[PDB]
Design a protein around this ligand. Structure first.
Ligand SMILES: O=C(Nc1ccc(Oc2ncccn2)cc1C(=O)O)c1ccc(Cl)cc1Cl
Ligand SMILES: CC1=C(\C=C/C(C)=C\C=C\C(C)=C\C(=O)O)C(C)(C)CCC1
Ligand SMILES: [Zn+2]
Ligand SMILES: [Zn+2]
Ligand SMILES: [Zn+2]
Ligand SMILES: [Zn+2]
Lengths: 359, 8, 289, 9
DNA sequence: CTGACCTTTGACCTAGTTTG
DNA sequence: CAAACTAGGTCAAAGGTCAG
């Protein structure tokens, strides 16, 4: 709940006179309980969760700066955890959250929550698994054509064509999960049903990649609720056409993740994708634009504070949107040339629906 | 059109 | 009491998610830190032994991935005015058979562009190599953005800088009425209903210019950097010039997708009219293609 | 060429 | 480059501190 | 004393260095 005064991530309590992370804690003690002297530094190294162990002299400095002191070890259990439960500092909850800079912080929360329910495997569980800082059985890995043989994953309800199909499935499965999340967007279930659909007919694509970039990483992608992991190299080695399908996605993935966004953000960004007034074949547009503006206003704020340090991130994030079109339009070009020089399309109807006549 | 069955 | 899941040596415990030796541990580490990319000379079937593990890096790292050596478990090495892009200058530089009609224009404007570009701050300072890579990539988009703006006034067509309309029914005749209309409503219809400021159109074309993803850059960073500036100068210019429009900067950037989408579907036709030999084309255009 | 040329100064 | 040898981190558990 | 918490301690797993 409460952030650490020094590095930033979740704090394990009030330690040495200040709320700090378990790491910053042990650091502080190891320091003074050994009276250590780290090399100086004229560089005010901004200490942050991601890069905190870069410079000691600065991590120790920030420590003291925020109050790290052995003269404040306030042992034991806390009396009026409410005087301080004034929302930590209601100096914003009613002072910063306004004029309407509270609906935004509410819409975000609303979306985020709605997001949590619609999507089984968020980015958090994903990055959890990938870094091993989880608790579950390591993902089985599919690296050989042999490793594949030993390949049974519960997808909700040739070899290349077999893998691709697996994709088909999840894609469909998610065209659904996304659908729900849409209904949950404020004012969506309202706009002309004709457009509502049109907005998914196009949104889904762009949303998928985004989704599928949390499951992905430089070396592979996660499969089956993240119980399995397929190597970027295995996929890159399939039959002529099929060996490329997955690359573009991996490419986009690496670039996108450089942004280091969390679920709190993909919830708002995902929305910003659906509600777009530049889709081909839309009727009443003012109402669509209408919402998007709001969400955007929400999103910018969301970032501005969630990721304080970074700069232009918001502008940058929006940028990827022009990148997602580049893909979808192209990805389709392939679907064309493919259905041509190949039989057994075995395409799911739902996808058949959304692929028929796009860009 | 199949989508209808989802949003409706 | 274990053994490296990769080669067999005495594993000193768990490293990046698996039992392994100091060797494999450290090898996986540098490959990740430095972002190396190995390749196999033979047929990605090289056995990884406690003896011939250093035999092939590609096949070695690949086995690490197989025994599930989580790359994300490797940590970051423990070490290490708004007018830096004068909006002014930008605006300044910004001041300087129909398929054929079009093409005859593209060429004329294809030379102009370079002038516009060289006139964009910092651009020229970039390695001549990069200056080319850059212009080669977005010339398509760039040109569309410009004439797309110039056509704000007209009704159902576009202008070419050489003063020749090209209404709908006319393009449809040439069999390009669709891509064409797309231009009309995904760009013009938008820019107009927004009264797109020339300066803004100035910045956008500049951001389009500074595409750091173009393949073959002596230094992407420099370019990402440059583009990110324009994000600032432009954000500021908006913060000022339009205080009543909160998300103008946003709705202004959201113009970009439509542009790329169309730009792509445009080179579609070009290559086609080309090979077909369809109508005459000019030397500069041919160079771009 | 035509571009490299023009982008030579 | 490799990997053997050696130093920090920090998630988690013990012992001890204040409330209520 | 039960409830609610925090310095310290510990050890696996990270990081780093520099002959070879
Ligand atoms: O491509 C995807 N998934 C898979 C692709 C291949 C696969 O492999 C496979 N296919 C057929 C038979 C055996 N294995 C399994 C999955 C999965 O999600 O489980 C995918 C699509 C959309 C989204 Cl949102 C996420 C993923 Cl992971
Ligand atoms: C626009 C357009 C086309 C041509 C080429 C492109 C991509 C740009 C032309 C720019 C000009 C002619 C700019 C100017 O006058 O400044 C084609 C034939 C595919 C069909 C209709 C849409
Ligand atoms: Zn901390
Ligand atoms: Zn420092
Ligand atoms: Zn080993
Ligand atoms: Zn090999």
């Amino acid at each position: 709940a409460i952030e650490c005064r020094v590095c930033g991530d979740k704090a394990s309590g009030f330690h040495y006179g200040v709320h700090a992370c378990e790491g910053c804690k042990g650091f502080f003690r190891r320091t003074i309980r050994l009276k250590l002297i780290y090399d100086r530094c004229d560089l005010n190294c901004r200490i942050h969760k991601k890069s905190r162990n870069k410079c000691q002299y600065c991590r120790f400095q920030k420590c003291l700066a925020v109050g790290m002191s052995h003269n404040a070890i306030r042992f034991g259990r806390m009396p009026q955890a409410e005087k301080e439960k004034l929302l930590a500092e209601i100096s914003s909850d009613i002072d910063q959250l306004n004029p309407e800079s509270a609906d935004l912080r509410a819409l975000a929360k609303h979306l985020y929550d709605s997001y949590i329910k619609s999507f089984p495997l968020t980015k958090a569980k994903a990055r959890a698994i990938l870094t091993g800082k989880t608790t579950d059985k390591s993902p089985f890995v599919i690296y050989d054509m042999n490793s594949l043989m030993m390949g049974e994953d519960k997808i909700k309800f040739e070899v290349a064509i077999r893998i691709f199909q697996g994709c088909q499935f999840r894609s469909v499965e998610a065209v659904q999960e996304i659908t729900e999340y849409a209904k949950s967007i404020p004012g969506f279930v309202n706009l002309d049903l004709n457009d509502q659909v049109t907005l998914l007919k196009y949104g889904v694509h762009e949303i998928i990649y985004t989704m599928l970039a949390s499951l992905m990483n430089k070396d592979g992608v996660l499969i089956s609720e993240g119980q399995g992991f397929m190597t970027r190299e295995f996929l890159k080695s399939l039959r002529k056409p099929f060996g490329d399908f997955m690359e573009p996605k991996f490419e986009f993935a690496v670039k996108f993740n450089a942004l280091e966004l969390d679920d709190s953000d993909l919830a708002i960004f995902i929305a910003v994708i659906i509600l777009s007034g530049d889709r081909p074949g839309l009727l009443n547009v003012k109402p669509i634009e209408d919402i998007q503006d709001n969400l955007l206003q929400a999103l910018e704020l969301q970032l501005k504070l969630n990721h304080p340090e970074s700069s232009q991130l918001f502008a940058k994030l929006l940028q990827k949107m022009t990148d997602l079109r580049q893909i979808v339009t192209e990805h389709v070009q392939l679907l064309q040339v493919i259905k041509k020089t190949e039989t057994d399309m075995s395409l799911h109807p739902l996808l058949q629906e959304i692929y028929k006549d796009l860009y | 059109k199949i989508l209808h069955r989802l949003l409706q | 009491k274990h053994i490296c899941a990769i080669c067999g040596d005495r594993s000193s415990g768990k490293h990046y998610g698996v039992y392994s030796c100091e060797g494999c541990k450290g090898f996986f580490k540098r490959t990740v830190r430095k972002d190396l990319t190995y390749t196999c000379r033979d047929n990605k079937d090289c056995l990884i032994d406690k003896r011939q593990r250093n035999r092939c890096q590609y096949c070695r790292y690949q086995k690490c991935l197989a025994m599930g050596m989580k790359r994300e478990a490797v940590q970051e090495e423990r070490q290490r005015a708004n007018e830096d892009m004068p909006v002014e200058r930008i605006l300044e530089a910004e001041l300087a058979d129909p398929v054929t009609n079009i093409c005859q224009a593209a060429d004329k404007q294809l030379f102009t562009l370079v002038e516009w570009a060289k006139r964009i701050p910092h651009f020229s300072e970039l390695p001549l190599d990069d200056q080319v890579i850059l212009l080669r990539a977005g010339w398509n988009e760039l040109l569309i953005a410009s004439f797309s703006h110039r056509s704000i006034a007209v009704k159902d067509g576009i202008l070419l800088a050489t003063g020749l309309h090209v209404h709908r029914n006319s393009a449809h005749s040439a069999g390009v009425g669709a891509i064409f209309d797309r231009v009309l409503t995904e760009l013009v219809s938008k820019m107009r209903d927004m009264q797109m400021d020339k300066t803004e159109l100035g910045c956008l074309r500049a951001i389009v210019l500074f595409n750091p993803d173009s393949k073959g850059l002596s230094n992407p960073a420099e370019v990402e950097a440059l583009r990110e500036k324009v994000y600032a100068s432009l954000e500021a210019y908006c913060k000022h010039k339009y205080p009543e429009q909160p998300g103008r900067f946003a709705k202004l950037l959201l113009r970009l997708p439509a542009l790329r989408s169309i730009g792509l579907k445009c080179l579609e036709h070009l290559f086609f009219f080309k090979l077909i030999g369809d109508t005459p084309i000019d030397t500069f255009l041919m160079e771009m293609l």
